[model samples]
Target: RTVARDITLLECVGKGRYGEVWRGSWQGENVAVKIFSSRDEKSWFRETELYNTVMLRHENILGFIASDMTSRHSSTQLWLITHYHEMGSLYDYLQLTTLDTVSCLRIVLSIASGLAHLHIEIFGGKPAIAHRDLKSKNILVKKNGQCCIADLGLAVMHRVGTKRYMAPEVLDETIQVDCFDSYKRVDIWAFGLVLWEVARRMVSNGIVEDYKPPFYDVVPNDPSFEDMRKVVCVDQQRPNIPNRWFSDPTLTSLAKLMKECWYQNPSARLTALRIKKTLTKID
Candidate 1:
């Protein structure tokens, strides 16, 4: 059951290559409205189709409220309406905050839980969807101190992943594209990066490092395919894990766990369920 309503754009919350995200109001309540650029028509269509078709309802996954294709002067404005998270993306939240043991586990575990849910599916024998572009920026911080995975634009019911987070097989063009497991592996590699990002801001022994994106030192901003291929495939390198992480048992365990996700052999990487189990143990 759905009803259409006019939402007032309150303020611009974010802007990127795709388009702008506005803090909008609908029925006197706040909602997130992502207006897709005309250039990203396919992405808008794909996201809308997935949300409506999949009937994806999960606590750790961003809540989808509605989708609208409104007419403008010429081009159409594709709008995706969703539950708003005031804390914003995990990337933004980490910059202004540090986490304790509980907070850290809550965030990462919730992420894993969401990924696991997406990687497994029911309903008419549905295919397990893969979030090709899993990253800190793709995860939102909810008011409950947990995080929700969002931005399914690059997600593939089949397969499509970001260059920076591409697994070695993905970068080397050796992945078996037809295999669903192959896509899941790519997401795992990116998940390792996301875990690394969150762990950087986790306080241990009253110490915490400033947040930094994965491969910050290895690749330039908006890295090219070849650049990431060289760093990730040629060198078989991954984000560095600081020795300080070993001092904290939680961080130490996470370090050990994330390494498995970066395995050169896609088959060797830990499953999302395995990651959740490991994090639960850490908690």
Candidate 2:
């Protein structure tokens, strides 16, 4: 019943131009309320569009409960409610702590599993999907030690992904828009960048690098498309794999895996299923 789902806002967990996210209580249970501004209506509609129909419920995808629009304080507000994760985004989590090999593999493998799920099409069920914006900030770390993909704002089934994580093809405006595989390849590129972000924080042989975003050295803060084009497409630069990663077998294997995702040719990139299989074999 709608009455049973009434949520009482407890605290604002996050806020920005998009709107605010609140830790809200509903029927004694906690749920995250992502309040969207009118400006972000498309994002809200897109999220609701995908979750409302598609069987998007998966262990690695964010849990969606409801999407609502209501009048409050004489203004219209849009809300997308989902399960709350106390651990927050992987971006924040990585900054605060380093990860052991097991924990690191668990996080990456779970993400691979989720991406594979999204990329594969079922005969009569879920359609093939591509998370256009697969980044550290868009992934939420769960208390279970695994993480779930979130923030489907720019996610495509295809939109252009984030500028900083754009693939070489995207940066050069060479992405084949008519082809679905192009979108999936774009996701693979972003996934590689995310892998780099997580692997940096993975402690190996008692060594770990500080958490930094992909292309932290080459691009400016919030890099533009042209800046990314110069570095990614023209310069053909991928994230740096530290020499220390070679010292640990796990990080070594991860370095290899992520490299396959960053190939110059989008078609040459590894598929999500292949990534999942490789990650499953990693010790």
Candidate 3:
């Protein structure tokens, strides 16, 4: 029984080629509703089905409330209702403010926890998932100073990851498609990039670099596959970690860990469990 509910679309909070994301009202509560374009129909269906078919409820993962297919005469509207975070995406938050040591660690650790759970395959739990588009924009900040992973549009169970976050194998088109482990490795690469993004804003010894997206120094805005391919695959370059990071023990340790995630050989990358465990050890 799919209850379309008394969902009221409030205001458009965000929009992209995927569709528009709006803050909506349902049963006197606020929820985020992502309306899908015709071209993005499959992404909506896949994400909804994953939620319905599998009990993928976790705190760090985005809360999915409902999936509605409402009819409007000539067209069918796809709506995915989720918990609304007023704090918005990590990308937006990082651009505006800097993080103290505690806040910085909380953000990265929460993200790692979410990614780790998504990658885990328990006996009756969710099948392993690889968020093909793991970036600062895809993460949302909560009031509690933690981050949750969202936007599973380009997500894979096993597609091609976003070029900016795409692993070297993916850029070169040499990824082993049949291997599920390959997808997980791709996620690790993106996680490393995200780590770099968050680390840039961490204030240590009274020094914090301005927020910049990963590969900001190299790739153009909305980079094409070839542009990313040349830099990541041909040149094998990663985002530069500032020398200031080495001055602080916490940043120094994170710098070391992110490097493990950026290993050119996918097999050499640290597993989510390993990364989480190491982050936990940081004081």
lDDT string, candidate 2, 1-283, tens digits: 3467578999998998788999999889889999997788888988888776684889999998889988779878889999999889999999999999899999999998888988888875787888788899888999899899888776666245679988998888888989999999999999999999999999877788998999999989979889999999898988999999988899899999999999999989999999999999998
Write down the lDDT of every candidate, Cα atoms only. 0.88, 0.88, 0.88
lDDT (Cα) of model 1: 0.88
The per-prediction CA RMSD against the true structure, in angstroms, equals: 2.0, 1.6, 1.7
Worst 10 residues of 3 by lDDT: 153-162
Per-residue alpha-carbon lDDT of candidate 1 for residues 1-283, written as tens digits (9 for 90 to 100): 8865989999999997789999999989999999987777788888888876676888999999988998888778799989999989998999999999899999999999999999996665555899888988889999888899998887777335667777888778999988988989989999999999999999988888888888989899989889989998888888888888988999999999889989999999999999999998885
TM for candidate 3 is: 0.96
What tens digits encode model 3's per-residue C-alpha lDDT throughout 45-155? 888767766767888889988888988989999998899999999999999999988999999999999999999888746688878789888899999999999977666
Pick out the ten consecutive residues of candidate 2 with the lowest summed lDDT: 153-162
Q: Candidate 2 regions off by >4 Å?
A: 72-75, 158-160
| Model 2 per-residue lDDT at 99 | 91
Give the poorly placed runs of model 3, Cα more than 4 Å off.
1-4, 158-160
Give the TM-scores of the predictions, in the order they appear. Answer: 0.95, 0.95, 0.96
**What RMSD does model 2 have?**
1.6
